[PDB]
Each structure stands twice: as C-alpha cells, then as structure tokens.
C-alpha cells in the first residue's frame, strides 16, 4: 500500500496544481485545504434515504477483496456490481449483501468489544443492577442546573483530552510530551493496554 501511496502521490504531483499547492501550504494550513468541500448537503435526508433504499445498489462499498466472499448475485438476488464509481471510486452494493453478511461470511473477533466500548457496557451495567421503587405522583419541584449528562472516567479539559487521546492511540507524532501525560500516566497505560489487540 505504501507503494500504492507513492504511485498515487507521483500521479497527483504530475499535475502542476498539486505541485504548487503542496509546496505552498504548510502543514498547519492543511486544515483550511480540507474544508474546501462542495457542501452540497442533501436538502431533505428523509426523502433521499427513502429513495436510496429502493434503488438497486445504493450502498457505496469500498474497493477491496471482501467482495469476492459474496457473489454479485446470490440465490437469484442481485447484491453487488462491478461498475466503476466516481463519487467514491469504489463499488456499489445493496442491503441484501449486508443482510447476508449478518447471516453468513467471515467470523470476527469478539474480544475487542469487552473493553473498547467500556462506557456503553458500564451504562448497561448501571441500568441492569439498578433498583426501582415507588412512584410519587404529586408535583415535583425542579431547579435548572448545569449538570454533567454522562459520567466520565477522568474529567479533563478538551485540549488535554485530545493530547491524551493522541498519546494513547497514535504512538507516532508525539513530540515533546507536555505537562499533561505525567498527570494522566495511569489512564494512558490503562487505556493503552485495554485497546491493544484490536483492529477497529
């Protein structure tokens, strides 16, 4: 893929616009470059989704070797097509293939969900073991308060949160650790160990 990366880079540079923009915009400016998208946002998502679900192949599949696991038509039902794509450069597919994959196909690893989605399973644990009581139908006095919607493992400001996330799951690009990793070293090591062994 790194060879594919270099070949794609060379092909992109062959055009002069890519050469001039790449050599002009610094790394910091990249953000601006990314935000120059079409912004042709769908005006009504409900109608779009309704129409798409009735189309032959609305699903936009990423090009890869997964498709070979499933025929282009199974049990006389069309699943995927080999026609090229312009929006995503991949293939097209239908929810039929998705349902078949949920039915048959490769079997993945169940370990990752034990720890990766720890917050959700903790929510479920707090719900299941909760004890209910009576209901008081009388009027309730309520005050408007600034409340934390969800429990947090270790509340930190957004910048420290981003730095910790990068230090956890992005081993590269970790120049000069600030005065925040030492404070959260235990969290760093715990999350690092827990998330190791995954493929998400």
């Amino acid at each position: 893929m790194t060879l594919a990366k270099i070949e794609l880079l060379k092909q992109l540079l062959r055009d002069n616009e890519a050469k001039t923009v790449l050599k002009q915009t610094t790394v910091d400016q990249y953000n601006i470059i990314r935000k120059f998208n079409t912004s042709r946002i769908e005006k009504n998502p409900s109608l779009r989704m309704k129409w798409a679900m009735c189309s032959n192949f609305p699903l936009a599949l990423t090009k890869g070797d997964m498709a070979n696991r499933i025929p282009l038509e199974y049990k006389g039902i069309q699943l995927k097509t080999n026609a090229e794509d312009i929006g995503t450069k991949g293939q097209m597919c239908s929810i039929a293939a998705v349902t078949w994959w949920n039915t048959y196909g490769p079997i993945g690893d169940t370990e990752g969900f034990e720890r990766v989605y720890e917050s959700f399973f903790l929510r479920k644990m707090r719900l299941d073991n909760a004890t209910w009581g009576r209901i008081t139908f009388g009027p309730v006095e309520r005050v408007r308060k600034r409340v934390l919607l969800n429990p947090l493992t270790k509340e930190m400001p957004p910048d420290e949160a981003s730095n910790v996330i990068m230090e956890i799951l992005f081993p590269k690009e970790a120049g000069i650790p600030r005065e925040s990793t030492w404070i959260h070293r235990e969290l760093i090591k715990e999350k690092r160990e827990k998330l190791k062994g995954t493929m998400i």
């Binding site: 923009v21 910091d28 912004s39 109608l47």
Partner: protein
C-alpha cells in the same frame, strides 16, 4: 348532536391545550420570488422616503438616509432614528454595567486575531459573484480565493482572517478584476468550461455589495411569504466579527434572550417574571406586554449600527475600530438582486415566457398586472440598469441578529422617562420582545407602555400594535413559549422530528431514540407518549429500510434474506430491528445503543459476523459524521455492518491532496496537524520512513523498495 373541538377549551385552559391549536402536522406552505423581493424593497424605501435622498458617487446607485431624519408624526413604521438618542441609550447601558463594552470588544478582538479564514466556510448558502448565483459557502469561498490569486491578492494562504479582510478591502480598488466564469459551450451538448473573464471596478463594487434573494418557503405559521437574503463572501468576515462582538455584549445582559437556547431560556423567562413580581410596590400593578415586533429589519438603518459599533469600541486600537466598522458601511450601501423576473403569457396562442429582471422595464408597463404595474412604477427610481434595486436603508432578515437584540436591550434598559412613577424591564430576542411595566395603577402602566413605545420609535424599532397585547403579569408568551401561573408549557412543536435521520440504520436509530429521550426530558412528553413515539418510530424505521420481523409474511428483496437469517440463527432475541429482530427498547434504556443492549442475547456467530473488525460496508472516510448528526447533535452508535454510507448525488486538487494527506498521516483526520513546512516534504519523509519500515519488516520486496525510493528520489526530499 354536532361535535365541536373548541369546546375542549371550556373544560381546559388554552395554555394546557395550546399544542392542539397549532397545525404543525400538515404540509408547510411552499412556493416567483421577484415579486416579493420588489415588494420588500418598495416597503423598505417607503418607510424612509422622507429621509435625505442622494446619489452615491462610488457606485452611482440612489441612497436614502433616514438617520437623524424628521421625527414621525404617525403610527406608521419609521426608520428615522436619532443618533443622539441611540448614543444616550448606549451610555446608559455602559453606566449600568462595569466596563462591559471594553471587555466584550477586547475579547472579540482576541478571538478575531485567532480566527482562521476557513471559519467562513460554515453557515448556509452564500452569494457568489463570479457566477452571480447562490453557492455553498465552502465553494463560494474557494472560488473567491482562486479569483483573488489572479489579481495580485493574497492573505488566504497567510491563514488568519485579518489578511483575508485586508486584501478583500484592497480588492475594491483594483482598476480591473479577473476571475474564472462558467462557460456552457455548445458542441448537441452543453459542456461547462472555465473562461478567464474580467470586470471593471464599478461592476465589481456592485457585485460585492449585491444581496441575493430567495423565498422563505420553509415558514410554518405565516400565510404571507417573506424573502430571505444571502450575502457574499466579502461581507461574511465583517458580519461575523460584529455578530461575535454583539453576542459577547448581549450574553452578559440579563435582558437578552439570545444566544441561550433550551431550558436556559425558560429559566431566564421565569426568573425575570419572578423578579418583576418581587419588585412591585405595595398594591401596585405589574403589567406584561406580549409584543411581537413587525418590520423589525425594514426600519433598522445600518448607519445606526455603525454608530453603535463605534461607541461600543470607545477604547480600543484604531485598527480594530476601523475593521469592525466595515460591516455597517457595506450594509449601508448594499444592493439587492431581484429573483428571476416575472412571467408573461398569451392564452390565445398557448405561449409563455419568463422575463429576466434586467428587462423589467424593456416592456410597456401596461402589460404587467395592475399590482406589478404599481410595483414597478414605484421601483423605477431605484432600479439599476443591470437588474438590481438600490436598497440602502433597512436590513434584510437574519444578518445582525445579535446587534439588533443589543439595540432592543438598550431600549429596554432605559427603565424610566421623566422620572415618572413607574419602571419597565423585559426580555428581547431577535424580533420578539416581552415587556414588564410596574406602577401604582393600570393608567400609569399604560403611560409607561406608551413612553416605551415612543422611545422605541426613536431608534427605528416599531412594535406591532396589531400582533401585540397587554395583560396582568403571570400570563404571556415569549418566542412561542407560554407562561401562565408559573406553568411554562414547552409548546409541543418538536413533533416533526421522529422521522428517520437518513444517515444510516444504526445512526438513524440512535438519533431517533436520543430525540425521544431529550423530548421526554425537556417538553414534558409523558411516558405513554414516549412509548407510542417509540412504536411509531420503529414502524417507520422498519418500513423505510425494508426490514420487518423475519416471522412476518411480508415480501421483499432483503426480507427473504431476513427470513433466512431468522431460522439460520438460534438466538432470536439478539437480532437488530434492521435484521428483523424484536424491538427491545423502552423508556428505561433509551440512553443505551441497542448493539450493546443486545450483545448478551446475540449468538457467537452472529456477533462475529456483524461486529467484524473489517467490514466492506464500513469505511474510514465514512466516519466524518460519527460525532454530530446534522444543528450538530451528538449521538452514540457502534461500529458494525450497519454503519454504512449512502451513494453520492481546484476541486479535485484540494480534495485529493487532503485525502492523501489523511491516508498518510492517519492522525490528521482527528486533530489539527502542526508544522511549519510544506506538506510535500512531510509526506515524502513519512513515506520514506514507512517504506524502510515495511521492507525491514518483510512486508515489501526489494524491487518494491527500489521503485519507491526512485520516486521519492525524483520528488526531491531523499
């Protein structure tokens, strides 16, 4: 017996059953907008026709100046705002608050020096002058950046918004203006190409000052249609800065309903009414005026906003004072585009033709309908030859919401006129104000109300005497929220939100359930109502994605596969509602994603298949929306086969450059990268390191390494 639904109000208060009055279940009204735009221009100039009429020598378009104009002698709307009175109100606000103006201006300047140009990509559709149309903000900004490169204009590459605004202001002086225009060349096929076009200085000034128009069709509770205006990218930076400053000022003001939204606004409303009830003298009356302002933007002169900006920044750097005063100047000399023009038809020949606006007066007026005849006979004085209307006075809806709110709060905060035995205070938010007047009797209450009305008329504000009423404190309405005897019914208007979110199965489901739970928390939706909402939403969700219960005899393409899966897997309580599984969601667990909810009940094969580490239905580039659902609403979902994306409905340059950079540095997609070097060299170094590591690990062959190296060699960073 003849039924009568209104009789429900005999046994119930109106506020309690207020939700049923609103027809927020039928088809909202929907639509040429040229007639409405011309009517709006006509009304805007009519209200200020007595001002000073002159001719701009920078653009040649007629201008009407109502500020410091004759004081109105009638109840009709008046834009004749006296500058001294505005400054008096601002001074009273400044005295009533400790250096609020200075703090707000300084904070606005600081956040401005940190703002980037790309912030202008947010918002809604914007007027693009290179094509003279309405285009997405991102595309319009990109096109203007590209055009500026040709005329020796730069600063977008320099980053911050200061250089972009500086070279935007510079562009107004260039003797020419070159750009790329779309040319639909005939070849029969119509192929679009880029043509290097040029326009003069006056044409460019007119294009920059022009305000595009559209019909406000989405409105729900108004019979007559209003026109919404979209401005160009050359005003977005200044309007944004002034709006941020006004937001900073108004946030502290306890009289301002904005920008706080939700239960905060209810808290403010109840707190204000309680405060006024507490402050009443003994045996006196505190009357509440339920007000609904009209012509709230056809009477506000941008010159008053220029004066307000200058007074607000009394003590600030000269450069910032000049910068933040550009938006009122651009708005005070704005021009309005005019829809797509009227349509004339002959029925004796079954012929019809739409007449473009520039040709409005190329036809004898005796052929338009009498109403449009009068409209054009009145619009002729301000009609530009190009097909635009010179609209100096007044404002279009939606531009200075915060600044207009600040002016309204300034009017509210005077609190007295002539030391008369009364006081007043209230809530104001963007064309909706509720006032409270405390006195020793009703007569003095209305003396105060009349004084406040007169004072408002001295600033261009004209409260609607037809859409407003007055009563005793403890019962009123503010921005469609009703208060009565301490009971604030959140008027149930979030009903049109239970449809599928149309992003994907799991995400749509999570969004719907979170919407249900939020409505339960906020609007007082009862448990039975929430259960029925869950039922209806699940019905619609199953229908829209053609996935009903596997047992049910319904026929469909995916339904056959769902039926197969129903018996091919033993554990039948773990399937998802997208896989014909049984619904499990209830009130107690609307806050838990179902995938984790049914994780125990699934089967090992089923969970392995659905929660595969790699899914051809899941892509990295599809993750953009995993955080916020377009208002940006946070939803919690789970990675899986049902996390797919729908098909799509210097562009490629930027797009593929960014895509490749993300694919190289996978960390870029999450957090802003940092570096003072060209992107090319960063990518080259990273790719060289990656190639060496891949080879040393045996993942790449030797011939592969040589090839890669050569390429990276050519590039010039090896």
């Amino acid at each position: 017996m003849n039924i009568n639904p209104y009789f429900l109000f005999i046994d119930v208060p109106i506020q309690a059953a207020i939700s049923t009055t609103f027809p927020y279940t039928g088809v909202p009204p929907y639509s040429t907008g040229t007639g409405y735009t011309i009517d709006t221009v006509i009304r805007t100039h009519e209200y200020s026709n007595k001002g000073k009429q002159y001719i701009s020598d920078v653009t040649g378009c007629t201008m009407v100046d109502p500020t410091n104009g004759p004081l109105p002698e009638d109840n009709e709307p008046s834009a004749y705002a006296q500058l001294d009175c505005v400054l008096e109100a601002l001074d009273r606000m400044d005295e009533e608050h400790p250096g609020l103006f200075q703090a707000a201006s300084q904070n606005a300047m600081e956040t401005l020096m940190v703002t980037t140009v790309d912030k202008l990509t947010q918002g809604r559709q914007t007027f693009d002058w290179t094509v003279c149309r309405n285009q997405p903000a991102a595309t319009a900004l990109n096109t203007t950046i590209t055009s500026f490169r040709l005329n020796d204009l730069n600063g977008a590459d320099k980053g911050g918004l200061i250089p972009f605004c500086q070279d935007i202001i510079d562009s107004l002086d260039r003797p020419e203006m070159t750009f790329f225009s779309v040319k639909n060349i005939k070849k029969i096929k119509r192929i679009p190409m880029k043509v290097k076009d040029k326009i003069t200085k006056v044409e460019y000034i007119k294009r920059a000052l022009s305000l595009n128009t559209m019909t406000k069709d989405a409105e729900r509770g108004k019979l007559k249609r209003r026109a919404i205006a979209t401005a160009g990218i050359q005003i977005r930076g200044f309007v944004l800065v002034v709006e941020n400053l006004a937001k900073n000022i108004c946030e502290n003001l306890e009289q301002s309903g904005l920008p706080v939204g939700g239960n905060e606004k209810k808290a403010k409303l109840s707190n204000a009414v309680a405060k006024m009830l507490s402050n009443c003298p003994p045996g006196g009356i505190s009357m509440t005026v339920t007000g609904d302002n009209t012509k709230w933007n056809e009477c506000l002169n941008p010159r008053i906003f220029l004066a307000m900006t200058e007074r607000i920044t009394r003590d600030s750097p000269i450069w910032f004072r000049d910068f933040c005063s550009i938006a009122p100047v651009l708005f005070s000399n704005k021009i309005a585009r005019l829809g797509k023009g009227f349509m004339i038809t002959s029925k004796t020949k079954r012929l019809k033709a739409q007449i473009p606006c520039p040709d409005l007066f190329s036809i004898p007026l005796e052929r338009y309908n009498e109403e449009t005849r009068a409209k054009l006979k009145k619009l002729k004085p301000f009609f530009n030859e190009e097909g635009t209307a010179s609209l100096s006075p007044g404002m279009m809806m939606g531009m200075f919401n915060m600044l207009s709110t600040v002016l309204g709060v300034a009017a509210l905060g005077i609190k007295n006129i002539g030391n008369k035995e009364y006081l007043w205070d209230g809530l104001q938010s963007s064309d909706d104000f509720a006032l409270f007047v405390n006195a020793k009797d009703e007569e003095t209450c209305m003396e105060g109300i009349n004084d406040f009305y007169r004072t408002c008329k001295l600033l261009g504000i004209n409260m609607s005497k037809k859409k407003s009423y007055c009563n005793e404190t403890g019962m009123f309405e503010f921005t469609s929220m009703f208060y009565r005897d301490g009971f604030v019914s959140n008027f149930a208007m979030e009903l049109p939100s239970f449809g599928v979110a149309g992003v994907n199965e799991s995400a749509d489901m999570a969004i719907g359930m979170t919407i249900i739970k939020n409505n339960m928390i906020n609007n007082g939706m009862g448990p039975a109502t929430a259960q029925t909402a869950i039922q209806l939403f699940i019905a619609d969700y199953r229908y829209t994605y053609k996935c009903h219960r596997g047992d049910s005899k319904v026929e469909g393409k995916r339904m056959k596969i769902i039926k197969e899966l129903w018996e091919n897997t033993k554990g039948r309580d773990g399937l998802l509602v997208a896989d014909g599984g049984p619904n499990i969601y209830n009130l107690r667990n609307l806050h838990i994603p179902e995938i984790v909810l049914k994780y125990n009940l699934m089967d090992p094969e089923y969970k392995g298949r659905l929660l595969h580490p790699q899914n051809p239905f899941v892509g990295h580039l599809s993750i953009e929306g995993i955080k916020e659902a377009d208002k940006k609403m946070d939803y919690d979902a789970v990675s899986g086969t049902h996390s797919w994306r729908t098909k799509r409905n210097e562009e490629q340059c930027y797009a593929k450059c960014c895509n490749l950079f993300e694919a190289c540095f996978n960390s870029a997609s999450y957090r802003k990268p940092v570096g003072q070097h060209s992107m090319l060299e960063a990518m080259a170094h990273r790719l060289r390191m990656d190639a060496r590591l891949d080879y040393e690990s045996g993942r790449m062959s030797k011939d592969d390494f040589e090839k890669a190296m050569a390429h990276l060699g050519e590039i010039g960073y090896i």
